[PDB]
Design an enzyme around this catalytic site. Structure first.
Site, PDB file in Angstrom:
ATOM      1  CG  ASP A  36      40.588   5.719  12.114  1.00 36.87           C
ATOM      2  OD1 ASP A  36      40.973   5.882  13.291  1.00 36.87           O
ATOM      3  OD2 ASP A  36      39.356   5.759  11.784  1.00 36.87           O
ATOM      4  CG  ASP A 221      41.191   6.766  17.396  1.00 36.36           C
ATOM      5  OD1 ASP A 221      41.611   6.495  16.234  1.00 36.36           O
ATOM      6  OD2 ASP A 221      40.061   7.289  17.635  1.00 36.36           O
TER       7      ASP A 221
HETATM    8  C1  LIG Z   1      36.298   7.250  11.242  1.00 38.96           C
HETATM    9  C2  LIG Z   1      36.808   8.239  12.293  1.00 38.96           C
HETATM   10  C3  LIG Z   1      37.237   9.568  11.698  1.00 38.96           C
HETATM   11  C4  LIG Z   1      38.470  10.115  12.019  1.00 38.96           C
HETATM   12  C5  LIG Z   1      38.881  11.320  11.470  1.00 38.96           C
HETATM   13  N1  LIG Z   1      40.159  11.793  11.873  1.00 38.96           N
HETATM   14  C6  LIG Z   1      40.718  12.997  11.610  1.00 38.96           C
HETATM   15  O1  LIG Z   1      40.256  13.845  10.863  1.00 38.96           O
HETATM   16  C7  LIG Z   1      42.019  13.226  12.315  1.00 38.96           C
HETATM   17  C8  LIG Z   1      42.560  14.509  12.411  1.00 38.96           C
HETATM   18  N2  LIG Z   1      43.737  14.722  13.007  1.00 38.96           N
HETATM   19  C9  LIG Z   1      44.359  13.665  13.530  1.00 38.96           C
HETATM   20  O2  LIG Z   1      45.537  13.786  14.173  1.00 38.96           O
HETATM   21  C10 LIG Z   1      46.157  15.079  14.204  1.00 38.96           C
HETATM   22  F1  LIG Z   1      46.790  15.281  13.056  1.00 38.96           F
HETATM   23  C11 LIG Z   1      43.838  12.375  13.429  1.00 38.96           C
HETATM   24  N3  LIG Z   1      42.667  12.171  12.814  1.00 38.96           N
HETATM   25  C12 LIG Z   1      38.077  11.975  10.535  1.00 38.96           C
HETATM   26  C13 LIG Z   1      36.842  11.448  10.195  1.00 38.96           C
HETATM   27  C14 LIG Z   1      36.444  10.250  10.772  1.00 38.96           C
HETATM   28  F2  LIG Z   1      35.246   9.754  10.415  1.00 38.96           F
HETATM   29  C15 LIG Z   1      35.612   8.441  13.231  1.00 38.96           C
HETATM   30  C16 LIG Z   1      35.868   9.475  14.315  1.00 38.96           C
HETATM   31  C17 LIG Z   1      34.673   9.658  15.256  1.00 38.96           C
HETATM   32  F3  LIG Z   1      34.953  10.468  16.283  1.00 38.96           F
HETATM   33  F4  LIG Z   1      33.610  10.178  14.635  1.00 38.96           F
HETATM   34  F5  LIG Z   1      34.277   8.496  15.776  1.00 38.96           F
HETATM   35  S1  LIG Z   1      37.296   9.005  15.359  1.00 38.96           S
HETATM   36  C18 LIG Z   1      38.109   7.847  14.349  1.00 38.96           C
HETATM   37  N4  LIG Z   1      39.068   7.187  14.945  1.00 38.96           N
HETATM   38  N5  LIG Z   1      37.883   7.562  13.013  1.00 38.96           N
END
Ligand SMILES: C[C@@]1(c2cc(NC(=O)c3cnc(OCF)cn3)ccc2F)C[C@@H](C(F)(F)F)SC(N)=N1
Length: 370
Positions: A36, A221
């Site tokens: 992340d 991101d």
């Molecule tokens: C920490 C937080 C967060 C991310 C995710 N991310 C996924 O589940 C996901 C799914 N598919 C993806 O690509 C396709 F394959 C990529 N990532 C889940 C929980 C979470 F907490 C926060 C997130 C926020 F939006 F709440 F800020 S964004 C963010 N940047 N980090």
């Protein structure tokens, strides 16, 4: 140049993100951890949430140290945990062991994904957005401080169902991309903040004040799926995408992500111009509908796709929709991010994702929001 042992060290499922194997504690506990670049905490499941395959068991580790501090992290889900340190390693990563901060997650809501194969998150962004504050040193910072791993990492995220890719830690692997890398400055070390200076749909400029492209920031991101755009920009892009793809009509709910469509060249390429390294110089990254029309494979009631460009109130988020087109180099040492055409990106016989320059673009500093 070549880090064969780190190639293909990422796994995932479509829509659930990309994770890497890590070990925490002594003896080592194996966990899958979401990569992340949009957050800055190393946070792992530490209690038996029923969705989790595995979790950090602090009692089994001799090298665990309690920091005697809690942290509560709400989003628009949430998680709560207990701060400590322990020894951390990456089996398909550099041959090192680091003492890193770990948030042991003890309660959460809408955070973990029911059905996924990861049980924590590796926040790779900067200290300024670490919870509870910037004194909690992020993992990569500890990695660099304690070893001779150079201060950069690169990501190749490969879409379309299993997904894969590579996180090259401390370097660049030249087999992961074609053509040249083009670099945009990291405007501020908090998020991986960058500046977008022009937007084109099928070569047609949107013609907006470029400040709107970055209201109130633009970030890179890996932890977000969509290309997220500021409301006004999204408005203008959908209008232009609708026009370009006029041979078929579609309901307004599809463009808003409120419904799927079930059924490429109908749809236009999208180009973002990014601030270059030199005064008045930019470059252009271009994605296909293959990146932004994402298949939804879990439709029991139905070949369906979701429109994965969406409106945002937190700025532009260059998520998986962008990153799957490109090999992306987070060159922390030089405060810049490199993009090149990914050797794994999904494309066809007619069109390919592209990274091109240089272009002449005036007033690029004015595109940043203050
Ligand atoms: C920490 C937080 C967060 C991310 C995710 N991310 C996924 O589940 C996901 C799914 N598919 C993806 O690509 C396709 F394959 C990529 N990532 C889940 C929980 C979470 F907490 C926060 C997130 C926020 F939006 F709440 F800020 S964004 C963010 N940047 N980090």
């Amino acid at each position: 140049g070549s880090f064969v042992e780190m190639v293909d060290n990422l796994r995932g499922k479509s829509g659930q993100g990309y994770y890497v194997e890590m070990t925490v504690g002594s003896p080592p506990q194996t966990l899958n951890i979401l990569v992340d670049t949009g957050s800055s905490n190393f946070a792992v499941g530490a209690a038996p949430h029923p969705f989790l395959h595995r979790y950090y068991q602090r009692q089994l580790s001799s090298t665990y140290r309690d920091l005697r501090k809690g942290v509560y992290v709400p989003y628009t889900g949430k998680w709560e945990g207990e701060l400590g340190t322990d020894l951390v390693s990456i089996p398909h990563g550099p041959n090192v062991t680091v003492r890193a901060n770990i948030a042991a997650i003890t309660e959460s809501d809408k955070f973990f994904i029911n059905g996924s194969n990861w049980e924590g998150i590796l926040g790779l962004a900067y200290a300024e957005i670490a919870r509870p504050d910037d004194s909690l040193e992020p993992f990569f910072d500890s990695l660099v401080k304690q070893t001779h791993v150079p201060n950069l990492f690169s990501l190749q995220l490969c879409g379309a169902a299993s997904v894969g890719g590579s996180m090259i830690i401390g370097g660049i692997d030249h087999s992961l991309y074609t053509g040249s890398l083009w670099y945009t400055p990291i405007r501020r070390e908090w998020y991986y903040e960058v500046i977008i200076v022009r937007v084109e749909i099928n070569g047609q400029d949107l013609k907006m004040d470029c400040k709107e492209y970055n209201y109130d920031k633009s970030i890179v991101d890996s932890g977000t799926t969509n290309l997220r755009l500021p409301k006004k920009v999204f408005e203008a892009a959908v209008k232009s995408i609708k026009a370009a793809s006029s041979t078929e009509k579609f309901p307004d709910g599809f463009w808003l992500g409120e419904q799927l469509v079930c059924w490429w060249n109908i749809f236009p390429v999208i180009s973002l111009y990014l601030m270059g390294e030199v005064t008045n110089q930019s470059f252009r990254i271009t994605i296909l509908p293959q990146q932004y029309l994402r298949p939804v494979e879990d439709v029991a009631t139905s070949d369906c796709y979701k429109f994965a460009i969406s409106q945002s109130s937190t700025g532009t988020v260059m998520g998986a929709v962008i990153m799957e087109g490109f090999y992306v180099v987070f060159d922390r040492a030089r405060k810049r991010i490199g993009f090149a055409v990914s050797a794994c990106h999904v494309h066809d016989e007619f069109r390919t994702a592209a990274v091109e320059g240089p272009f002449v673009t005036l007033d690029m500093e004015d595109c940043g929001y203050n």
